[PDB]
Amino acid sequence: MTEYKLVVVGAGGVGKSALTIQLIQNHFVDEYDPTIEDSYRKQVVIDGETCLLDILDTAGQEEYSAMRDQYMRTGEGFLCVFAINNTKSFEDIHQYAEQIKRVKDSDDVPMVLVGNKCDLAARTVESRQAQDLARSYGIPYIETSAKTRQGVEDAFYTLVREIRQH
Ligand SMILES: Nc1nc2c(ncn2[C@@H]2O[C@H](COP(=O)(O)OP(=O)(O)NP(=O)(O)O)[C@@H](O)[C@H]2O)c(=O)[nH]1
Ligand SMILES: [Ca+2]
Ligand SMILES: [Ca+2]
Ligand SMILES: [Mg+2]
Ligand SMILES: [Mg+2]
């Protein structure tokens, strides 16, 4: 069957692990344990296609983000995550988008922009601000909550549908 290699990137603490774990394991991780590099694999049906999702959960902390560059190389699509209550994480999306272009050596890489923690009310990144960034990249913007599951499946499945357009 088809295997989709997804890579989740973004600043420390934005919810990359919580998103992946909600998708794969159907529970919310409340605690904050910084990731080095973890992998998840699950067979799913997406739009009638039996798929294997291979998901790489990467480090957002600079301290633990050593061999990030090497493990991202095989990625077929990237979830670029920021948190809607963390303006700096939004501003830093460009650093990831540019690192992605490097490891893939292409200007046309399947990507989805994700604004996570949308259950929170201390919002400092407005939807329209993120829509504009996504539009500049020619990619979708989707908001998610790893806590409530809002948008979680839609974000990962949208990334698969972006990979299929390339
Ligand atoms: N309210 C709320 N909290 C969230 C959400 N997603 C993650 N969190 C919280 O934010 C903290 C960090 O989440 P985590 O998934 O570990 O972040 P990360 O991006 O993987 N961090 P790292 O890059 O260091 O591995 C945790 O306390 C987690 O419960 C969300 O959608 N809503
Ligand atoms: Ca593949
Ligand atoms: Ca812990
Ligand atoms: Mg993590
Ligand atoms: Mg503002």
From Swiss-Prot:
Membrane topology: Lipid-anchor
Motif (Effector region): 32-40
Listed GO biological process terms: adipose tissue development; animal organ morphogenesis; cell surface receptor signaling pathway; cellular response to gamma radiation; cellular senescence; chemotaxis; defense response to protozoan; endocytosis
Post-translational events: Palmitoylated by the ZDHHC9-GOLGA7 complex. A continuous cycle of de- and re-palmitoylation regulates rapid exchange between plasma membrane and Golgi.
One term under GO cellular component: glutamatergic synapse
Tissue and organ distribution: Widely expressed.
Modified residues (N-acetylthreonine): 2
Keyword Ubl conjugation belongs to the record: yes
EC class: hydrolase
Effect of residue 61 to V: Strongly increased transformation of cultured cell lines
Positions of modified residues (N-acetylmethionine): 1
Activity control summary: Alternates between an inactive form bound to GDP and an active form bound to GTP. Activated by a guanine nucleotide-exchange factor (GEF) and inactivated by a GTPase-activating protein (GAP).
Sites carrying sugar chains: 35
Record keywords: Acetylation, Cell membrane, Cytoplasm, Disease variant, Glycoprotein, Golgi apparatus, GTP-binding, Hydrolase, Isopeptide bond, Lipoprotein, Membrane, Methylation, Nucleotide-binding, Nucleus, Palmitate, Prenylation, Proto-oncogene, S-nitrosylation, Ubl conjugation
Top-rank lineage group of the source organism: Eukaryota
Effect seen on changing residue 29 to A: No effect on interaction with PLCE1
Effect of residue 119 to N: Loss of GTP-binding activity
InterPro entries per record: P-loop_NTPase, Small_GTP-bd, Small_GTPase, Small_GTPase_Ras-type
Protein role: Involved in the activation of Ras protein signal transduction. Ras proteins bind GDP/GTP and possess intrinsic GTPase activity.
Family: Belongs to the small GTPase superfamily. Ras family.
Linked pathology: Costello syndrome: A rare condition characterized by prenatally increased growth, postnatal growth deficiency, intellectual disability, distinctive facial appearance, cardiovascular abnormalities (typically pulmonic stenosis, hypertrophic cardiomyopathy and/or atrial tachycardia), tumor predisposition, skin and musculoskeletal abnormalities.
Protein's recorded name: GTPase HRas
UniProt organism field: Homo sapiens
Species classification: Eukaryota, Metazoa, Chordata, Craniata, Vertebrata
Gene: HRAS
